[PDB]
Amino acid sequence: TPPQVLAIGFFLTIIIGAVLLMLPISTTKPLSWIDALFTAASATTVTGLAVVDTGTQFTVFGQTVIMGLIQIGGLGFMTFAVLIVMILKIGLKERMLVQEALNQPTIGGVIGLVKVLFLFSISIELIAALILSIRLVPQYGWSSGLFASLFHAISAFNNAGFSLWPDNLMSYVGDPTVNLVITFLFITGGIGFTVLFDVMKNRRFKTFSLHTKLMLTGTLMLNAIAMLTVFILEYSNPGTLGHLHIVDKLWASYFQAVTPRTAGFNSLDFGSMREGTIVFTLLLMFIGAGSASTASGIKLTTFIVILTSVIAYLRGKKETVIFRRSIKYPIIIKALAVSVTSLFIVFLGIFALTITEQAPFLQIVFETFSAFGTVGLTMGLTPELTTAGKCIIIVIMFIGRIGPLTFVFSFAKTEQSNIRYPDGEVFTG
Amino acid sequence: TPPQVLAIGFFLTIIIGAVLLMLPISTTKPLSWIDALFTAASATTVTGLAVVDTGTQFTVFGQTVIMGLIQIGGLGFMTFAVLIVMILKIGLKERMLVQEALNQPTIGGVIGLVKVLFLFSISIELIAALILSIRLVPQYGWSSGLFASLFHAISAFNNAGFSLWPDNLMSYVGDPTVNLVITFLFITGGIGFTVLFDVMKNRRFKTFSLHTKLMLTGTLMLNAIAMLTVFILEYSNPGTLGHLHIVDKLWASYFQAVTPRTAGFNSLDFGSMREGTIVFTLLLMFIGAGSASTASGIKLTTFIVILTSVIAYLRGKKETVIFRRSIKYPIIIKALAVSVTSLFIVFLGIFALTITEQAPFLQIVFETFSAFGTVGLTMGLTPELTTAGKCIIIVIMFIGRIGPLTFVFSFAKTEQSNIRYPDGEVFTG
Amino acid sequence: KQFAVIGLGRFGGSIVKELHRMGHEVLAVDINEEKVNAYASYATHAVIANATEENELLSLGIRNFEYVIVAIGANIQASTLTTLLLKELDIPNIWVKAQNYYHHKVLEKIGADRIIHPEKDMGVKIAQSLSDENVLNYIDLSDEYSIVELLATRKLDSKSIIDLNVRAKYGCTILAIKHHGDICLSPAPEDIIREQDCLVIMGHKKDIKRFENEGM
Amino acid sequence: KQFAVIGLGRFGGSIVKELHRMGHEVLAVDINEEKVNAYASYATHAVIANATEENELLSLGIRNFEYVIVAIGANIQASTLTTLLLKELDIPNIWVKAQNYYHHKVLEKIGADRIIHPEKDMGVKIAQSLSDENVLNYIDLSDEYSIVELLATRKLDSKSIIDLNVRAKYGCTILAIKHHGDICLSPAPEDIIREQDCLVIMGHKKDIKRFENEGM
Amino acid sequence: KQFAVIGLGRFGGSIVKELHRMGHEVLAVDINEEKVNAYASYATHAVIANATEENELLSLGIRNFEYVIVAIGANIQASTLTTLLLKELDIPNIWVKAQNYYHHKVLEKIGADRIIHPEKDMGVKIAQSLSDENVLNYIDLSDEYSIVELLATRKLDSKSIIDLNVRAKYGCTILAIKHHGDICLSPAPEDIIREQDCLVIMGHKKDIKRFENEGM
Amino acid sequence: KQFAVIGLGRFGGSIVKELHRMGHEVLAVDINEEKVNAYASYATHAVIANATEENELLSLGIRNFEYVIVAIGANIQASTLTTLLLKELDIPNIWVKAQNYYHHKVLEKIGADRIIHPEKDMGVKIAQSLSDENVLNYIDLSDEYSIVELLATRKLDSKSIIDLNVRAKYGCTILAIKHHGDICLSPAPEDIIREQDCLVIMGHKKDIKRFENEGM
Ligand SMILES: Nc1ncnc2c1ncn2[C@@H]1O[C@H](COP(=O)(O)OP(=O)(O)OP(=O)(O)O)[C@@H](O)[C@H]1O
Ligand SMILES: Nc1ncnc2c1ncn2[C@@H]1O[C@H](COP(=O)(O)OP(=O)(O)OP(=O)(O)O)[C@@H](O)[C@H]1O
Ligand SMILES: Nc1ncnc2c1ncn2[C@@H]1O[C@H](COP(=O)(O)OP(=O)(O)OP(=O)(O)O)[C@@H](O)[C@H]1O
Ligand SMILES: Nc1ncnc2c1ncn2[C@@H]1O[C@H](COP(=O)(O)OP(=O)(O)OP(=O)(O)O)[C@@H](O)[C@H]1O
Ligand SMILES: [K+]
Ligand SMILES: [K+]
């Protein structure tokens, strides 16, 4: 079935990926059973967590395998499947999978979205990454420069989190090129391919879809909240951002407000933040960025819908409405299903890990959220995980990326009861 | 004003309660501004947390003020208001408030519920508490025995959490009388007054309301899960339950499975539990017990509804149905509003406290949940709270008890837009 | 006294609206959702309920009410069933709107405490004012004796109270005069009566119409 | 063991309500939501379902029932389709309500196990009581022989049973007497029969009416 | 600067579609959900609302609008009530669609600012073009004087503007010529007029028809 | 080859059900929700959509289909609009169901690729079988020549294929014989023909009926 095909195919490219990475040519120092599967999974589920450092452990070859898996997961397993066939057409059966894969209600010219998204991807990936990230990165030479400038784009656009070198980009806290060029890439990758195609086509402030409108104003105002949050909280704290010029205090406060959904790049260390900021960063990375998309757990719109729904209820207008175009019921209940599932899974991961591992609590909590949110950010349990803890993070990374729903729908017995039942009074207050 | 009247009246008996407790006659050692308000609030919001120990700091007089406030909050501010007037009738305006206060959809003979609940309360409070807790508690004499046996009932039935003496009842880990007589009291107080009246009247396994049916089977199976959970996890751990006879290992595993919603009594210390159990206890005390009720944050039924709703959606039956009597929509969306509000508040309390205080994370988290859930259980920040931290726990205890909804409805501008708006497509996946 | 208005008609809705303006406790009931929503603001309380279903009536806690008014006048079946329920549920005062003589009869037999024909009653009163262009308003004390408010014709302009007596001539008594809005109650002869001034006379129905003919 | 009542009419609803009062297992089915909700309390179960759709009938687990009653008597199409489904799904006992002779015929041919005309049957019984004001109630043993309950006229007041023998004289036998509520089953001659007492006679239909004519 | 179109008819819907294409602020209102949904894309806003209910009209914030257009032309009751509300709510400009002479009269009396009969008006204009096959389009300057667009017959093919004078002969003046799409505004004599070329004449209504008769 | 069946009638629904059983790609479209739900299992795919709205048709990605079948035969307006849309959207093959001669005409003019009258066609074929009780089934090769399947009368029982020659005698040729289910294709003289066997003859329409008359 459409959900299963998404699942089995996705799982396979992780196994494929793991066997490729465990392969000699890609490893400098011999690699574990569990770690080969974990690192592979995190590239293909575009998470960003790594048990083993990427720049050190993986050969130029293995790092290309990493890019491939990042490319695969970031755009979507099916997207390439369609492209393979396209280049090699196109069935309805196929158009059905694609629609499911790009979480679309309609099958309406959905291959036209696959056409656009891919062409737009490799386009902005190339021009911004190769070109602009070579302006200020051939002080690594050519053999190092052109490969690290490219790798970081494919990782950026796709919201991976994978930086080649040990500092997950702390080195460049202030560098405007790396700041801008990498945020440009990972925010626009984030918001809907819907939003990109819509903005490219319609071209006017007004003529944007209710989705696109919500996404453009939503991503803007949440970023502006989070930046103000990261600034105000981490301003005094000397550990991070205390010892920075008033200007570099921004480039960091900006970046850390923006990276949690769902990029995974470090401008500062996350281990050394006032616990409040971390708490806030948890919420900010439950809510991913966009539904198109590159990745999320429950995606920004979902959050709006459920929130605005409850707000509406509390007033209480009989129907939930944004932007004066009202929101149908089947959206609310799907939102409520996306929401509950994701949270319940994250809770089980937290509960599991406090029994799988001996470690600090907040660190487990941040770790589970970032695993499901395919974020990539840690205060650093990641290298310190138990073999069992790595497993359950691998699971949580798999479900989080594939979507908590389409995972259930893979083993869900589809039951259509046509009969109704009498009303039942039940107090909820 | 039905919501406001509930709120202002409830807030007043806390202020009344605080001024009464700050009064000389009730205190042995002079008491703070903040602490008088906190301890008062916790008795009247039937929470169970105390900054200052109850057995030591409060005179026999002050401990009676504590019982009064516990009685007031446990049954409901309005319940007594109605009784006052009854004994002194009865207007519709009044019947409106009562219905709101006992979270009822209908105003149908709702005073008959007030009649029953009160009479049943003082009835089981007296017979079980005075009599049964005096047959095995006159080992404190008469002046100490007959007062501590009574106090613990009013505290038990009403899900307070307030034990008179320093061990919040650890002393009696094995004592069957205290175990049974106190669980009998705090579980039946918990489940709906609906459930009590219904069981008393209808008297048959078969003829129980959907609510009552859900509550009786719900409370049973969750208790049986939690006991198995507390046992399996805290079995090995020497800190608690490690050094107990296989029989007393039960009386503790039972009690700690049952007390989190929302009693607040200690059979074991919660500070020394494998973090897993605590995580589980968090969830178990987000979900209160019953909606009638004595206390909760988001009540057991609400949890079923939302869960069973998502389960249903995922299958997906077009309508959400339990026990083959289907659940109407207005219940789902209220459940979704109760749910979101409570969780969002608890999150703000956690975020606030990691800024308001220097302390361990898990301990703040457990503290917020238990404050909103009006639980009463701590890993022990309670005495160690900052003056500001005490404030925000007071707020969280106030909202949690009154209901997160009826709180919003007190300052909510009721707007009923009759116009509808066109459909809006929005991706949530 | 607690009031329940079942049926938010033009008649029912006016009772609810008035009793509520007077500041009583009024429960507004109607099967039509839109009607309930409308009278929400103009009642102590509004509820969607089908008054013919017993359990629905108990849910309102109807037994709480001293006075219940059934202002369903178009549907005879709805009205009769509702009132029967109300009598069975031992409501002290049941006031019902009737459609016609026959509907009145059924209500009578099932124990409605007071039956009203708002339209028929207002019909005859308006008809009187149509036929006799002089009578502005009136109230019947009995079948024979009545208090009538009359618009003064030019046949009375600047006439004195004693001068044009009715207490001797027609056996009727003038109770009030309203000139340009100003009111003179139990007026003392002589008083000036201008044209178009409200004259309030009292006596026998036939006697007044005799004064109307010869005086005006 | 298990009963399913499809169609909560006045007839169907009475079967569910009775069988449930007797404390059996009864599934109440109806396409109208409001009907299901109403009989919720008076059935082991209530379900909204369109009995003509197969998948909907399977969802009820209809094959679980020993006896299924189709009390749809106004809609012939609904009734026939439902019963056909039930027979096709191998239900052991199918009892259906029929509208008229023709509907009976269709049901007969599609294998309804027992067909009932509740109205027509009660019609003829009530007509008998109308025509013959003496017969209160009766039961036919065959086309010719019948047990009849008769209201005693003043023509029998303070008469002895053996004195006014029905047996020797008319070939009928008196089975019971009911005076002021008290019941004398299988009475022994002589017994007093007062006016308005229930007299239960048994014999030939023609014989009884001959006794009715000459005795009463 | 703000427009509200109540009633998304063929007429109303065309106003809201045009004004929006011009890029104004237009609120599209309709009681029918399906109509609102349809014009969602072709309006600054769309809202489902019953324009006869006051609270619903206030919810739109109707008092915001400079111009409100009531394009309900089939329902007289809906139209008159709405416009009355709008006038009562002090809207500066109220433009309403009328059904017939009588509906126009009701609107006139309740203070509609401008009343339009889109069908009747377009009727007479089309009728003119039917009767006179030569007149393509026209605009009346008054009851007597008019500017008319005429299709040139073979009676004018390759004729000169100076040669076949309208100014001296008939008292009318030619304003434009359209040959094969190309337009000669204010043409200077002489100019070639081919067959089927749009000739725009101006003068007295009777004068033009005299030219039509004798010239064409 | 991808198929889209708009209108899940008895006709449409049979096409989607068949094409799907053959294992093709079929999109089932219908405005009625209940129809879509029903054919969900019997189609590659089912969607609720109003085929007259363009945006709704694009949402299906209709332009992705090689063959689209409009089996709306009761609503002429629905059918004509839909087919017009499909032609405008450049669908290669549009097969439509027609109601009557006039509907056929409109479809013809708006460029439907093939028009079918499933009822009229099956009408004439069944009528033939009614009139001529011998003809079981047939297929017309042209207006004059036809292959006919005939039920053999006792007039042919145990007759030899050659002995009773149609080839020489009537100018027709026997193609097959079906005795008790067993089939003899292109039979060689002589063969036994029993009563009630299926005889398949081929030739001129008039010629066959002459054989029917004299042979059978
Ligand atoms: N079973 C019912 N329960 C509650 N309300 C009902 C019920 N049936 C009808 N109504 C309401 O009662 C009223 C029925 O009365 P009816 O409106 O049709 O008008 P009326 O009494 O004849 O005269 P008027 O409209 O002038 O008051 C309606 O407002 C209707 O909505
Ligand atoms: N397709 C159906 N499936 C199940 N129940 C149906 C269906 N159609 C109708 N019913 C219900 O079955 C019942 C049959 O009632 P029907 O009114 O149409 O007349 P009736 O049986 O003669 O009524 P009564 O029993 O009072 O004499 C009704 O409750 C009706 O709503
Ligand atoms: N009370 C109302 N409130 C809001 N909208 C209404 C109301 N009454 C009618 N409408 C809408 O306004 C329009 C009224 O137009 P109506 O079609 O029914 O005839 P019409 O004016 O002659 O239509 P047309 O413009 O095509 O000639 C419709 O779109 C209708 O849905
Ligand atoms: N605009 C539409 N878009 C999609 N489906 C439609 C539309 N209009 C009608 N239908 C559906 O087309 C289907 C075909 O039915 P149609 O009623 O119009 O009659 P029909 O051709 O005579 O039926 P049949 O094929 O059994 O003879 C129906 O299910 C109907 O609901
Ligand atoms: K990531
Ligand atoms: K508590």
mmCIF file of C-alpha atoms in Angstrom, chain E:
data_model
loop_
_atom_site.group_PDB
_atom_site.id
_atom_site.type_symbol
_atom_site.label_atom_id
_atom_site.label_comp_id
_atom_site.label_asym_id
_atom_site.label_seq_id
_atom_site.Cartn_x
_atom_site.Cartn_y
_atom_site.Cartn_z
ATOM 1 C CA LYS E 1 -12.571 53.361 -1.176
ATOM 2 C CA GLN E 2 -14.118 50.218 0.322
ATOM 3 C CA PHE E 3 -16.807 48.161 -1.424
ATOM 4 C CA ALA E 4 -19.269 45.577 -0.151
ATOM 5 C CA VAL E 5 -21.257 43.412 -2.591
ATOM 6 C CA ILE E 6 -24.167 41.677 -0.835
ATOM 7 C CA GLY E 7 -25.673 39.036 -3.122
ATOM 8 C CA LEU E 8 -23.325 37.192 -5.454
ATOM 9 C CA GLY E 9 -25.762 36.873 -8.351
ATOM 10 C CA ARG E 10 -24.727 37.065 -11.989
ATOM 11 C CA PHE E 11 -24.982 40.810 -11.525
ATOM 12 C CA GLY E 12 -23.471 41.048 -8.025
ATOM 13 C CA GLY E 13 -20.781 38.493 -8.797
ATOM 14 C CA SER E 14 -19.758 40.549 -11.834
ATOM 15 C CA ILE E 15 -19.334 43.711 -9.770
ATOM 16 C CA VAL E 16 -17.222 41.941 -7.089
ATOM 17 C CA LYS E 17 -15.213 40.259 -9.875
ATOM 18 C CA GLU E 18 -14.636 43.511 -11.735
ATOM 19 C CA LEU E 19 -13.915 45.797 -8.756
ATOM 20 C CA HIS E 20 -11.439 43.176 -7.559
ATOM 21 C CA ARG E 21 -9.782 42.965 -10.972
ATOM 22 C CA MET E 22 -9.444 46.765 -10.789
ATOM 23 C CA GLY E 23 -7.745 46.099 -7.454
ATOM 24 C CA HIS E 24 -10.146 47.627 -4.958
ATOM 25 C CA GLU E 25 -11.172 46.463 -1.543
ATOM 26 C CA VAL E 26 -14.294 44.339 -1.992
ATOM 27 C CA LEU E 27 -16.229 42.313 0.553
ATOM 28 C CA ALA E 28 -18.265 39.537 -1.071
ATOM 29 C CA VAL E 29 -21.295 38.548 1.012
ATOM 30 C CA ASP E 30 -23.830 35.789 0.335
ATOM 31 C CA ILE E 31 -26.157 33.568 2.382
ATOM 32 C CA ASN E 32 -25.354 30.608 0.139
ATOM 33 C CA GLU E 33 -22.109 28.930 1.201
ATOM 34 C CA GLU E 34 -21.341 27.596 -2.281
ATOM 35 C CA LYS E 35 -21.518 31.118 -3.792
ATOM 36 C CA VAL E 36 -19.088 32.520 -1.224
ATOM 37 C CA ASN E 37 -16.613 29.674 -1.799
ATOM 38 C CA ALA E 38 -16.769 30.326 -5.546
ATOM 39 C CA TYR E 39 -16.036 34.051 -5.330
ATOM 40 C CA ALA E 40 -13.349 33.568 -2.656
ATOM 41 C CA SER E 41 -10.602 33.881 -5.282
ATOM 42 C CA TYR E 42 -12.267 36.821 -7.024
ATOM 43 C CA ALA E 43 -12.729 39.059 -3.998
ATOM 44 C CA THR E 44 -10.606 40.784 -1.363
ATOM 45 C CA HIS E 45 -12.898 38.750 0.971
ATOM 46 C CA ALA E 46 -15.678 36.354 1.094
ATOM 47 C CA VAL E 47 -18.097 35.770 3.969
ATOM 48 C CA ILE E 48 -21.190 33.630 4.490
ATOM 49 C CA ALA E 49 -23.801 35.951 6.048
ATOM 50 C CA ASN E 50 -27.549 36.555 6.067
ATOM 51 C CA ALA E 51 -27.770 40.244 5.189
ATOM 52 C CA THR E 52 -31.237 40.598 6.754
ATOM 53 C CA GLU E 53 -29.963 39.803 10.259
ATOM 54 C CA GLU E 54 -28.465 42.917 11.896
ATOM 55 C CA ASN E 55 -25.896 41.279 14.181
ATOM 56 C CA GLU E 56 -24.572 39.317 11.175
ATOM 57 C CA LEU E 57 -24.147 42.544 9.215
ATOM 58 C CA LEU E 58 -22.294 44.188 12.129
ATOM 59 C CA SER E 59 -20.035 41.118 12.335
ATOM 60 C CA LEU E 60 -18.862 41.942 8.803
ATOM 61 C CA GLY E 61 -18.175 45.447 10.065
ATOM 62 C CA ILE E 62 -20.462 46.794 7.374
ATOM 63 C CA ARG E 63 -20.277 50.311 8.849
ATOM 64 C CA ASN E 64 -16.704 50.356 7.530
ATOM 65 C CA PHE E 65 -17.846 50.515 3.935
ATOM 66 C CA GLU E 66 -18.229 53.593 1.745
ATOM 67 C CA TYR E 67 -20.308 51.787 -0.914
ATOM 68 C CA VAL E 68 -22.539 48.756 -0.342
ATOM 69 C CA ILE E 69 -24.252 47.060 -3.317
ATOM 70 C CA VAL E 70 -27.335 44.885 -2.763
ATOM 71 C CA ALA E 71 -27.546 42.684 -5.879
ATOM 72 C CA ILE E 72 -30.457 40.618 -4.637
ATOM 73 C CA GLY E 73 -33.033 41.015 -7.404
ATOM 74 C CA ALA E 74 -35.199 37.891 -7.088
ATOM 75 C CA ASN E 75 -36.047 38.125 -3.407
ATOM 76 C CA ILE E 76 -37.879 41.397 -2.716
ATOM 77 C CA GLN E 77 -38.094 40.702 1.041
ATOM 78 C CA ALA E 78 -34.367 40.012 1.352
ATOM 79 C CA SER E 79 -33.517 43.121 -0.680
ATOM 80 C CA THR E 80 -35.806 45.601 1.107
ATOM 81 C CA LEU E 81 -34.850 44.429 4.593
ATOM 82 C CA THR E 82 -31.114 44.533 3.813
ATOM 83 C CA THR E 83 -31.241 48.019 2.297
ATOM 84 C CA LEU E 84 -33.320 49.254 5.257
ATOM 85 C CA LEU E 85 -30.637 47.894 7.609
ATOM 86 C CA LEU E 86 -27.913 49.590 5.578
ATOM 87 C CA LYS E 87 -29.725 52.946 5.663
ATOM 88 C CA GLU E 88 -30.407 52.573 9.392
ATOM 89 C CA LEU E 89 -26.692 51.782 9.892
ATOM 90 C CA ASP E 90 -25.837 55.063 8.104
ATOM 91 C CA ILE E 91 -23.992 53.655 5.073
ATOM 92 C CA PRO E 92 -23.172 56.633 2.776
ATOM 93 C CA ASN E 93 -23.864 54.979 -0.590
ATOM 94 C CA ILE E 94 -26.378 52.161 -1.030
ATOM 95 C CA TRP E 95 -26.778 50.796 -4.554
ATOM 96 C CA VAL E 96 -29.522 48.236 -4.988
ATOM 97 C CA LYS E 97 -30.769 45.932 -7.719
ATOM 98 C CA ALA E 98 -34.528 46.099 -8.299
ATOM 99 C CA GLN E 99 -36.857 43.449 -9.732
ATOM 100 C CA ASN E 100 -39.731 45.542 -11.066
ATOM 101 C CA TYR E 101 -41.406 48.947 -10.814
ATOM 102 C CA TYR E 102 -42.928 48.107 -7.400
ATOM 103 C CA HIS E 103 -39.693 46.864 -5.836
ATOM 104 C CA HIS E 104 -38.103 50.080 -7.089
ATOM 105 C CA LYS E 105 -40.794 51.996 -5.270
ATOM 106 C CA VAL E 106 -40.175 50.251 -1.935
ATOM 107 C CA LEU E 107 -36.413 50.848 -2.252
ATOM 108 C CA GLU E 108 -36.968 54.505 -3.152
ATOM 109 C CA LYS E 109 -39.024 55.044 0.032
ATOM 110 C CA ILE E 110 -36.524 53.330 2.377
ATOM 111 C CA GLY E 111 -33.730 55.519 1.027
ATOM 112 C CA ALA E 112 -31.656 53.484 -1.401
ATOM 113 C CA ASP E 113 -29.170 55.918 -2.915
ATOM 114 C CA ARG E 114 -29.191 54.519 -6.454
ATOM 115 C CA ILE E 115 -31.500 51.841 -7.923
ATOM 116 C CA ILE E 116 -30.580 49.765 -10.997
ATOM 117 C CA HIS E 117 -32.611 47.550 -13.360
ATOM 118 C CA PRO E 118 -29.781 45.712 -15.133
ATOM 119 C CA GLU E 119 -32.112 43.433 -17.075
ATOM 120 C CA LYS E 120 -34.767 45.998 -18.143
ATOM 121 C CA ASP E 121 -32.022 48.444 -19.220
ATOM 122 C CA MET E 122 -30.098 45.844 -21.218
ATOM 123 C CA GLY E 123 -33.467 44.716 -22.570
ATOM 124 C CA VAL E 124 -34.325 48.015 -24.288
ATOM 125 C CA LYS E 125 -30.777 48.399 -25.609
ATOM 126 C CA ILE E 126 -30.781 44.902 -27.178
ATOM 127 C CA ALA E 127 -34.305 45.448 -28.529
ATOM 128 C CA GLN E 128 -33.053 48.573 -30.350
ATOM 129 C CA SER E 129 -30.336 46.519 -32.005
ATOM 130 C CA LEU E 130 -32.894 43.820 -32.953
ATOM 131 C CA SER E 131 -35.351 46.279 -34.516
ATOM 132 C CA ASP E 132 -32.668 48.363 -36.203
ATOM 133 C CA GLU E 133 -30.151 45.825 -37.531
ATOM 134 C CA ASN E 134 -27.773 48.726 -38.270
ATOM 135 C CA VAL E 135 -27.228 49.954 -34.675
ATOM 136 C CA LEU E 136 -24.413 47.984 -33.040
ATOM 137 C CA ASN E 137 -24.247 50.030 -29.825
ATOM 138 C CA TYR E 138 -25.349 53.411 -28.425
ATOM 139 C CA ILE E 139 -25.404 55.807 -25.464
ATOM 140 C CA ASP E 140 -28.187 58.298 -24.689
ATOM 141 C CA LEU E 141 -27.041 61.820 -23.795
ATOM 142 C CA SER E 142 -30.671 62.727 -23.120
ATOM 143 C CA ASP E 143 -34.148 61.612 -24.208
ATOM 144 C CA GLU E 144 -33.678 63.297 -27.581
ATOM 145 C CA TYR E 145 -29.921 63.370 -28.311
ATOM 146 C CA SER E 146 -27.767 60.254 -28.632
ATOM 147 C CA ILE E 147 -24.407 58.868 -29.808
ATOM 148 C CA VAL E 148 -24.873 55.766 -31.985
ATOM 149 C CA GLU E 149 -22.439 53.166 -33.333
ATOM 150 C CA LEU E 150 -23.545 51.900 -36.749
ATOM 151 C CA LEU E 151 -22.511 48.989 -38.949
ATOM 152 C CA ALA E 152 -21.877 50.362 -42.449
ATOM 153 C CA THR E 153 -23.858 48.736 -45.279
ATOM 154 C CA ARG E 154 -22.730 48.283 -48.903
ATOM 155 C CA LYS E 155 -24.644 51.551 -49.372
ATOM 156 C CA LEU E 156 -21.559 53.280 -47.947
ATOM 157 C CA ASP E 157 -18.699 51.123 -49.301
ATOM 158 C CA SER E 158 -15.808 53.301 -50.516
ATOM 159 C CA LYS E 159 -17.685 56.540 -49.730
ATOM 160 C CA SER E 160 -15.992 59.800 -48.664
ATOM 161 C CA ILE E 161 -16.664 61.538 -45.343
ATOM 162 C CA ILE E 162 -16.808 64.976 -47.051
ATOM 163 C CA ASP E 163 -18.870 63.618 -49.981
ATOM 164 C CA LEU E 164 -21.617 61.949 -47.951
ATOM 165 C CA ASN E 165 -21.910 64.749 -45.399
ATOM 166 C CA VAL E 166 -23.854 64.260 -42.195
ATOM 167 C CA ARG E 167 -23.174 67.696 -40.680
ATOM 168 C CA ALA E 168 -24.980 69.796 -43.342
ATOM 169 C CA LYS E 169 -27.498 67.288 -44.688
ATOM 170 C CA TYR E 170 -28.888 65.723 -41.483
ATOM 171 C CA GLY E 171 -27.576 67.910 -38.639
ATOM 172 C CA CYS E 172 -25.535 65.051 -37.198
ATOM 173 C CA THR E 173 -21.765 64.651 -36.836
ATOM 174 C CA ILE E 174 -19.531 61.614 -37.474
ATOM 175 C CA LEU E 175 -17.085 61.025 -34.625
ATOM 176 C CA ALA E 176 -15.142 57.872 -35.526
ATOM 177 C CA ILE E 177 -14.505 55.214 -38.172
ATOM 178 C CA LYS E 178 -13.298 51.661 -37.487
ATOM 179 C CA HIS E 179 -11.941 49.842 -40.582
ATOM 180 C CA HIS E 180 -10.521 46.323 -40.018
ATOM 181 C CA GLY E 181 -9.853 47.114 -36.323
ATOM 182 C CA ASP E 182 -7.931 50.347 -36.971
ATOM 183 C CA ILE E 183 -9.541 53.419 -35.389
ATOM 184 C CA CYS E 184 -9.733 56.968 -36.769
ATOM 185 C CA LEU E 185 -10.958 59.196 -33.940
ATOM 186 C CA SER E 186 -12.078 62.690 -35.035
ATOM 187 C CA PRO E 187 -11.828 61.904 -38.786
ATOM 188 C CA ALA E 188 -10.938 64.615 -41.303
ATOM 189 C CA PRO E 189 -12.896 64.803 -44.608
ATOM 190 C CA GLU E 190 -12.324 63.058 -46.858
ATOM 191 C CA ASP E 191 -11.871 59.566 -45.411
ATOM 192 C CA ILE E 192 -12.725 56.160 -46.947
ATOM 193 C CA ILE E 193 -15.520 54.129 -45.334
ATOM 194 C CA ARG E 194 -15.586 50.455 -46.290
ATOM 195 C CA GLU E 195 -18.506 48.042 -45.829
ATOM 196 C CA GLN E 196 -18.925 46.611 -42.300
ATOM 197 C CA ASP E 197 -16.832 49.462 -40.841
ATOM 198 C CA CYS E 198 -18.062 50.890 -37.496
ATOM 199 C CA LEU E 199 -19.450 54.359 -38.020
ATOM 200 C CA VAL E 200 -19.991 56.489 -34.916
ATOM 201 C CA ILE E 201 -22.586 59.230 -35.452
ATOM 202 C CA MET E 202 -23.917 61.829 -33.006
ATOM 203 C CA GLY E 203 -27.003 64.066 -32.961
ATOM 204 C CA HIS E 204 -30.776 63.913 -32.565
ATOM 205 C CA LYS E 205 -32.338 60.455 -32.276
ATOM 206 C CA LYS E 206 -34.868 61.166 -35.047
ATOM 207 C CA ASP E 207 -32.159 62.761 -37.241
ATOM 208 C CA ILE E 208 -29.945 59.664 -37.110
ATOM 209 C CA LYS E 209 -32.782 57.301 -38.091
ATOM 210 C CA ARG E 210 -33.489 59.627 -41.041
ATOM 211 C CA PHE E 211 -29.858 59.225 -42.107
ATOM 212 C CA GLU E 212 -30.179 55.463 -41.571
ATOM 213 C CA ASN E 213 -33.167 55.385 -43.924
ATOM 214 C CA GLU E 214 -31.847 57.585 -46.722
ATOM 215 C CA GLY E 215 -28.072 57.151 -46.355
ATOM 216 C CA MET E 216 -28.011 53.404 -45.687
#
